[PDB]
Amino acid sequence: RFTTGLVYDTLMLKHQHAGRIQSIWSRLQETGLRGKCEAIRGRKATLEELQTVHSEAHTLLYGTNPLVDSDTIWNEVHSAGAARLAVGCVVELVFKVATGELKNGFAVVRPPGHHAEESTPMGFCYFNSVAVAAKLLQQRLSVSKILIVDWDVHHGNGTQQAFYSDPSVLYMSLHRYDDGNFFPGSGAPDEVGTGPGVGFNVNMAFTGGLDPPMGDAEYLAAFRTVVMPIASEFAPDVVLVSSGFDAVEGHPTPLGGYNLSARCFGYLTKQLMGLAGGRIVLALEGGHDLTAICDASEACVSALLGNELDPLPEKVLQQRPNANAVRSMEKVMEIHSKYWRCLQRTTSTAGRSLIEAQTCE
Numbered sequence: 237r238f239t240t241g242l243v244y245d246t247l248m249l250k251h252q253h254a255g256r257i258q259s260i261w262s263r264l265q266e267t268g269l270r271g272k273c274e275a276i277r278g279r280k281a282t283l284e285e286l287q288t289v290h291s292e293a294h295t296l297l298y299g300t301n302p303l304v305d306s307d308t309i310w311n312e313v314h315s316a317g318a319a320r321l322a323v324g325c326v327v328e329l330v331f332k333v334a335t336g337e338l339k340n341g342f343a344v345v346r347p348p349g350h351h352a353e354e355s356t357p358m359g360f361c362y363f364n365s366v367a368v369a370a371k372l373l374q375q376r377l378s379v380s381k382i383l384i385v386d387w388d389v390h391h392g393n394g395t396q397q398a399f400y401s402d403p404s405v406l407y408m409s410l411h412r413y414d415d416g417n418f419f420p421g422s423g424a425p426d427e428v429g430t431g432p433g434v435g436f437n438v439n440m441a442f443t444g445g446l447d448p449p450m451g452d453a454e455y456l457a458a459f460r461t462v463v464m465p466i467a468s469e470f471a472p473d474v475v476l477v478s479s480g481f482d483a484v485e486g487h488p489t490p491l492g493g494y495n496l497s498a499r500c501f502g503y504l505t506k507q508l509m510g511l512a513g514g515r516i517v518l519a520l521e522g523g524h525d526l527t528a529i530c531d532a533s534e535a536c537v538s539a540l541l542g543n544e545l546d547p548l549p550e551k552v553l554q555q556r557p558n559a560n561a562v563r564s565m566e567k568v569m570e571i572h573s574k575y576w577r578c579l580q581r582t583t584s585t586a587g588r589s590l591i592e593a594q595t596c597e
């Protein structure tokens with residue numbers, strides 16, 4: 237059926253008392269959303285597929301079985317094996333959407349991938365699943381234009397690295413930055429790409445700390461002023477999302493700190509669905525509060541299926557973005573007005589609420 241796809245595999249589970257992916261899968265079952273989707277069969281990525289992004293030595297070290305107590309080193313060996321499986325699960329879903337076998341999809345996968353660099357694992361990431369999917373779309377299907385949006389609260393340093401000189405992949409990261417003082421320390425607004433890729437790396441970097449925390453109004457405004465204008469101009473053929481949910485309320489000060497609602501991610505998904513004819517796949521990255529990530533996963537899948545979304549509260553729709561967010565947005569727009577026509581014509585309305593922007597448009 238031409239509908240929303242899912243990928244999940246119990247071989248990614250730590251114990252071989254529900255973790256993140258098992259809790260997300262259960263929510264999708266209980267809500268009936270799983271029943272409306274096509275769950276596909278995953279597989280291991282090949283060593284060759286992993287090597288579109290990573291070095292041979294890196295792939296051989298972490299991608300090969302050496303031949304489980306979760307408190308022993310063999311937990312990490314298993315996590316690296318789980319990563320190899322996660323990459324193949326994401327690749328399979330991405331290809332089924334990109335070929336039109338399925339409409340769109342959500343990959344319920346772990347570990348996350350977006351921090352893993354060419355020959356360096358880090359931040360719980362061994363292999364960059366989303367980047368590998370994107371490399372294979374280019375190499376195997378000659379996809380002309382790919383948008384990667386990364387809305388995990390931490391900068392996707394691996395994904396930025398993988399495509400930094402490539403103008404055929406637009407990488408857009410929304411993340412807490414605070415002038416270099418938040419993990420992993422990369423993703424300054426000034427980082428715009430290199431070579432022919434100049435202008436095709438967009439760091440929507442929030443600065444100013446938690447005075448106050450960023451919330452729905454701030455992210456909605458960032459989508460309005462930076463993400464959607466730039467993404468629309470680019471006009472991608474396929475959209476991939478590194479969908480971390482650690483920006484949702486309930487994630488404390490270093491491993492989070494923002495107070496987005498799960499409902500807001502549904503709306504952010506629906507916005508991205510207006511691009512690439514609806515050819516969009518989300519892949520789980522970070523987030524750890526089980527209620528928050530299950531709520532968020534539910535909102536996103538519901539949106540992908542075309543279900544009517546729970547309205548955002550009137551308060552959120554009427555809220556002007558906080559001063560630090562406005563400053564952050566305006567710095568990014570200023571930098572990227574050099575490369576994008578949608579940022580050259582105008583004056584900033586980043587300080588308007590959604591309703592005000594709508595009224596005044």
Ligand SMILES: O=C(c1ccc(C(O)(O)C(F)(F)F)s1)N1CCn2c(-c3ccccc3)cnc2C1
Pocket residue numbers: 348349350351359360361388390419480482490491521522523
């Ligand atoms: O911020 C992270 C994250 C790494 C990866 C993160 C992610 O982006 O959410 C991912 F990969 F899961 F998606 S978030 N850190 C910094 C703090 N930290 C810690 C802490 C240790 C002591 C006190 C506070 C945090 C352990 N491990 C980490 C890695």
Ligand SMILES: [K+]
Pocket residue numbers: 386387388389390391392409410411
């Ligand atoms: K990000």
Ligand SMILES: [K+]
Pocket residue numbers: 399400401402403405406407429433436437
């Ligand atoms: K790029």
Ligand SMILES: [Zn+2]
Pocket residue numbers: 388389390480482522523
């Ligand atoms: Zn994160």
